[PDB]
Enzyme design. Sequence first.
Site, short mmCIF file in Angstrom:
data_model
loop_
_atom_site.label_atom_id
_atom_site.label_comp_id
_atom_site.label_asym_id
_atom_site.label_seq_id
_atom_site.Cartn_x
_atom_site.Cartn_y
_atom_site.Cartn_z
N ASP D 45 -14.12 8.64 9.01
CA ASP D 45 -14.03 9.26 10.33
C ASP D 45 -12.87 10.24 10.39
O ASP D 45 -11.73 9.89 10.04
CB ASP D 45 -13.87 8.18 11.41
N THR D 78 -15.28 15.36 15.03
CA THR D 78 -13.96 15.85 14.65
C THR D 78 -14.03 16.74 13.42
O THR D 78 -13.43 17.81 13.38
CB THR D 78 -13.01 14.67 14.42
N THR D 79 -14.77 16.30 12.39
CA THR D 79 -14.89 17.10 11.18
C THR D 79 -15.76 18.33 11.40
O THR D 79 -15.59 19.34 10.70
CB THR D 79 -15.47 16.25 10.05
N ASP D 366 -18.96 4.10 15.62
CA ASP D 366 -19.46 5.46 15.51
C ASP D 366 -20.95 5.54 15.81
O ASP D 366 -21.43 6.54 16.35
CB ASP D 366 -19.17 6.01 14.11
#
Lengths: 480, 429, 502, 501
Positions: D45, D78-79, D366
Amino acid sequence: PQEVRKANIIAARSVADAIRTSLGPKGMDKMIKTSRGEIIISNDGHTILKQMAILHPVARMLVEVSAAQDSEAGDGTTSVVILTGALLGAAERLLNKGIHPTIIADSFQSAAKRSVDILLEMCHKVSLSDREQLVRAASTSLSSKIVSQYSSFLAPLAVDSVLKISDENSKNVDLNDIRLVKKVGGTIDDTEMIDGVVLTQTAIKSAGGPTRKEKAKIGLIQFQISPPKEERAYLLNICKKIKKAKCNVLLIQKSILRDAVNDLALHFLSKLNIMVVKDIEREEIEFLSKGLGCKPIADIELFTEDRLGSADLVEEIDSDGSKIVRVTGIRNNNARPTVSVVIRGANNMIIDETERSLHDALCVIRCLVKERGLIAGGGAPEIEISRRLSKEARSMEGVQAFIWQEFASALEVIPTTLAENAGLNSIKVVTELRSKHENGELNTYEEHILQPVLVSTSAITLASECVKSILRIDDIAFSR
Amino acid sequence: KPQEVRKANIIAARSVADAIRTSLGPKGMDKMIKTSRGEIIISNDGHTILKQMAILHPVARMLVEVSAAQDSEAGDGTTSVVILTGALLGAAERLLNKGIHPTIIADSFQSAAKRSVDILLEMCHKVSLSDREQLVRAASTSLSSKIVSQYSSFLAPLAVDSVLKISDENSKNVDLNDIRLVKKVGGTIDDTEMIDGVVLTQTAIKSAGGPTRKEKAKKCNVLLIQNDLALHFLSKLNIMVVKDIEREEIEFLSKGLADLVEEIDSDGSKIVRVTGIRNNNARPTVSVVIRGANNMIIDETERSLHDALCVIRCLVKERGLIAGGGAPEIEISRRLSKEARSMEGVQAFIWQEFASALEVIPTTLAENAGLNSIKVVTELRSKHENGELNDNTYEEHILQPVLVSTSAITLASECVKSILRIDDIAFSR
Amino acid sequence: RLSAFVGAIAVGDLVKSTLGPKGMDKLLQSASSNTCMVTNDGATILKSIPLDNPAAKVLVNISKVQDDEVGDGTTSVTVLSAELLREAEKLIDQSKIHPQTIIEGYRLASAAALDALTKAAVDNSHDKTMFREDLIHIAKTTLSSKILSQDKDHFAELATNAILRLKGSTNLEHIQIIKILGGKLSDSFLDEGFILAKKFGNNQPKRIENAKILIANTTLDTDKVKIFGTKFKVDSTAKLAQLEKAEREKMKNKIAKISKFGINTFINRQLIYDYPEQLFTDLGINSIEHADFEGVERLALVTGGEVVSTFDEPSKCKLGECDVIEEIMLGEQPFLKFSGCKAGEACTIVLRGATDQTLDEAERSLHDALSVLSQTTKETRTVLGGGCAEMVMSKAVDTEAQNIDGKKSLAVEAFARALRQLPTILADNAGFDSSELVSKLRSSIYNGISTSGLDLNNGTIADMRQLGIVESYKLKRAVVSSASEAAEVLLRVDNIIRARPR
Amino acid sequence: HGLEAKKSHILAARSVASIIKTSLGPRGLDKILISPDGEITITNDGATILSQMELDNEIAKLLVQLSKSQDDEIGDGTTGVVVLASALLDQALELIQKGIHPIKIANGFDEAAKLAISKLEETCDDISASNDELFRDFLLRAAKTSLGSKIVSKDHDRFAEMAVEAVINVMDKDRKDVDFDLIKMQGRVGGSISDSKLINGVILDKDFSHPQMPKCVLPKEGSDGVKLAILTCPFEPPKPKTKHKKFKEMIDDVKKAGADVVICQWGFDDEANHLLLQNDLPAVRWVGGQELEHIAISTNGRIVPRFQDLSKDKLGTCSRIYEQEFGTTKDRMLIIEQSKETKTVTCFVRGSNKMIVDEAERALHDSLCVVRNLVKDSRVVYGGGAAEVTMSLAVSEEADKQRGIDQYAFRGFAQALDTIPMTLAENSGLDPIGTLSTLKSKQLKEKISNIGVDCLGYGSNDMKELFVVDPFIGKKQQILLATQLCRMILKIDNVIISGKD
């Protein structure tokens, strides 16, 4: 990985060559100056390696080898270091030929086992029933010590002590059960075997102490007679519980914490004739628990009659500056009749070296217990092995065939050093020994020089595993 | 690091292209170069800058050979070909970071150069050499960059009528070295004689006995020499002698080369003319004679008329003309961007970067003229969508021949290829 | 990449030369140097030496997992993992292959390596008459302190037949346990019919011949089980039911895909509305409910099914079947006993107790009793050692290296080189030539003679069956499984994050 | 300055972005991280990895500030946003060298982002408007992709349904309001993952104190729910505030109401618990602050402050309370469910190791965020790289029709969207340039469709057969934060770093 091993071999060879000069009584003594300012001088190899404080990790293994050399055989602490360095010096060319250390290590263990059978065939088989060779072995071994005329009187005393505890299949015998108690005063001619037990100290010199008692029980007690930390009432219950088991001998362990026996308790024990011996060292706690067959008793409730021994007569022998207490007739079937010899003398330097002289005298006799027979020293057993390995090396095949030739060459270092330390020419004397070898074999017999076989056997066995473990470490790293 | 050695040569090559980039156009920035001998020269011509720069870098010297071939073939665009070469080198920098081998980069330029020519010919208007009205206005605009303006009206038919005689049909390469510009002291610009037969560089004998004129001369009537008694001997034999022939003109006369041989001197020239060679193997070589008073006249005029012959040379080898000023480079970048989706693989991404590398030429022209860089470029893509070749340079009489834009892309494909193919260099002697 | 590959080799070099009885030793030295020691233990050297390399801490947790299974072979795990990382340097420069594709190549090579060792594995189970008789006596010793000690003969007999009759994996996932009430423990029996508590159907018959079983997980009845929060905007009450009726018409798309498979038996975890169930009556489809989780997986193992809940393409799937489905009733509850399962291997021990306390104590004691019997399958069973098993695995890798794509060609081939590194290192510490012994061993096993091995005493190739040198088979799988998991994480590492000191 | 900071902001962003490019996707790297509180876990994550990064560059600090606010909205993007926003900065560096002001780049990407949203909606498909029965399978296979890189992938079949019911309970059908405060993640050491069950209520970590107390609660002759007492006043004789230096009255009032359990924060005494043992009234010691303030709404009961007004119908009612032994753990916790839908669902996961529990805890959390975005918008789009390729072709084609300065700002936005499929192509072992050109050719001459980069090994295109879908609101939230981040970076032309004392 060769840079790590070659660095350890060269570092160990310089240490072995340094101790090599100390072989024999005429050898070169090494000096060690401690950081505190103390300087010691002696030819003992175990003393030099212990106080040298070697920082090399592999070189420190010689201390453990020299420790087992004196514990098992009792002699050859310097010779085992020379043989260890001889194999390391010959191993320098073995690595240049591309030989893996596994073959080098496996060949030393295989050659050490075959070298024992070669010595046994050339050795003269003797028995422990004949006291002729037993007295002459301990008498000639004391020619290196100050005692000369008195050495003949102490020879049969050490023989009769070992033969009783040797038995037949007992093989190794613990040397901790033999305690040599040295004390100022007296002389060497006055000796007492006292097979029951011998303490390290005297008895109570105060007033009221009987100091002598007949038919008493001896046991280990860790308690101590002290006031509360009214006083006679607290000490009355202490002596009352001891009277229940009829224990007339009290052994108190020496401790600087509190005192031993109060002066008020001496008047109570004088009526019951209970002898007390204080100042018992911590090392003697395990010693008294073996020969006497007793058990250490921490508290007063743990004190029982079944853990108490037996003593026929306990008395204080009158002697100048000595006053040694003896115990006879322990009457213990489970415990074996060990021997504790008392050493007496006027000068302090007498009873000191006399104790060390009796150590090597008992080890040589003990070597005959494990394996009977003896081989005269002076390079005879080292050269005799190389004579048989000359034709045997041709019968081998492969890489190991070359090791047998180099193994016999490394054995010649020991007789070469003996000729150098005596001032004679190294090679010239060795060639004279191999020249007469076609006729004579063991011939040293007329000079009354005798050596046990276990010394020559353990020197090869310990040096074989030593060098074997040296090549096993190919890397040195920091771990903390 | 075999590729890092080549990347060091690419950065050094882009620094040379950025220096020449500021000199593009008549409004470009001049470059001051101080030679080791002490001579100080300055000019905006990219061919003269790279010639006297004395570049010691092995890969950077390739731009000099391309600039030499740019002036020898097309004759124009020696400055713009350096900018276009550096554009492909800058786009190839990001290609090496993606793991692309220069072989695909070099092979894709061959397909991109051939495609750009076919697209350019579709929007180009094909013209013929039979129309003399177009060639007059074409060469007259090239003379507007020089001090001579009002006197350039008579110089336009001089260059047009000389090429049309030797043009014929399907002539392909037409060598302009056979056309020599004669520079003599005296006269004016309006005074010019074609003399289609040939024109020499030397005068005749000023001594006594020289005939200086002969009819039906080649039994040798006229001879050339690369003693005073030898002139008197041949004077009785009626043999004209012309000595002091320049060594440079020896190879020139062996190519182009009489009914009448006479010496006509306007003022002070004392020059001999030849007409009607009528040779089967040899063609009709024409040498242009330029007259002027001051030295700066015949000099600047020589370089002005030489560039005018190169523009006409482009029309003879390749018919058609386009409007200059980076106008066609905008539409080519638009068509190749949409056609890039028709390809597949790594080569498809090269078509997108190749379109962006062609926009540096019109961008530099807007920067060196004082106009806003990015603002003018956005106006090019906007106006060229609805109209075709209407932006107006046609009213401003700006005409760039199609062969210059074709050779600039063709020579750039071979120049950039010869760069990336060098993976290392070592001392060899 | 250098610290994760070359830096990990230096960690493995400490345990490299210490492998084997003839292997070398290492030294652990402190600042005082008087606390040192000499030992060949690999787990002690790695934990004692402080490691400043943040990538070396990954191999620390790998040795802890191996020590849990068995205390032997910890050294060989790091050595085998070091050879895979050593060859990883050539997998980048001259190869340029994705690291995960290299890991996937190891899974295909490890699958053939375990199958190659199974056929060549031997055991001491020969003369099973003495071996099978001692299995019931061992289970009786485990009955101490357990309520099953009442009858040793009948209770231990069910555990004996629950192991040998499996003919496969001995894990408890192949054994079904049912806890029921209202009976005595002496009435328990062994039945393979896969008995479960719930029933299915109402008017449907209790006997099905030539049944086709398909496993799927979906909700066909009243999805979105939580209606709280919705807002229904309709012009009339009858128009609100139109959305529910429109869902029933869309159910035919899911039923049509099932009807094309020609199955009379369906598996569903959730419920089914009457309308899609009534359509199953005309087609003769019976649905089983309340399959939990093990019931879903264990049904696919005995019937040869699949656990996927979706259909990626019609007329392509993994279908099971059974001959006869019999439904009986015992203890006032209906039971389901299957019959005639194709290639079915399993057993179900039905424990019938008199209360809840006797059921929990019997199930927990049976797992410990079956664990000892199942341990005998992985214990005492060995394989031919001395370079034999290491070289045999290289032959199975070369078979997969024949037909392969372009990316995994160099990845599978590189794994075969690391397998021959185990006898190479063992021959180095033995004092002989490793290059000569390993080379001659591959050419012999290549054509015939699969039982040959390397003799450390004579330094030549000899028969391992005559010399009697064998190594445990459980140790072989434990090292390969540990090396496959340890190398899976390390090869995927493109960067190193230093761990926070505790 | 202008010629300094503007150039340094591009190089500072590429250094941080290039680190997470290797961990992007299911084939990326799982990084080992250790929290300062002592928790050790391994996960890919990006929100946790970026939060642990500590550096003095003021440009990279904006990523942590954006990921903190994005963690509440999605948390799994986020990525995706950092890589996409860094692609806009790479195209913006070339525009600055061309003479374009940086303020025009900020406004240029805004018109391209809003234009690409309408293009994606036209090609978008709906779930309820197409097939209703596949709505169950869409939520089951969505979590399978994220759990395929973890040990959870073995039991994923059962764990896929646990995430479906947890999101639905905390939300409304029309309102679609999901709060992370209503979903808790807990786990303990011991056991395995196969024993994990979905719990409809809190944990409480209660052993019921003395074992003689009943471990299960009876309905007490068909009563209403299970009577529970929430009270801040314990059972013990009081005193005044002026000193500092009754049993049968209080305890009988609770028995008349029927409250089985009493909650008090602090601990109890020995004899104090003896009176509650005879009446079968379990006691609660060491109450955490997590046990009040919401859920009781679903009880449909009343709240009585004191023992005087207690009655049968005014006490909170639940389904049942029982103590289930978990493995060999001596805690012996409880599970309280409810028949009616509640507003809070707490997931309970077990593992054989502490690192395994924390690995599956964030992996399951997630999956709850992915389902949260799927239920928020019934219309979903095909992901796996197909969203970035489809949205790029629409902007690149419409860039020529839009003239002016923004014409080049639209072309840079289309090329920036190609960074995502090229990054996933390198992580999948494929040519990033060759795959990008292949996806554009299949969507032009053949037919308009969504085909992305292959996450799992296959031989050809058209992943649409695998039924891999991504939420529309999830992908739309990423392009809005990436555009806003690129605009926010350009608004700072100077980096001011204060010293230390």
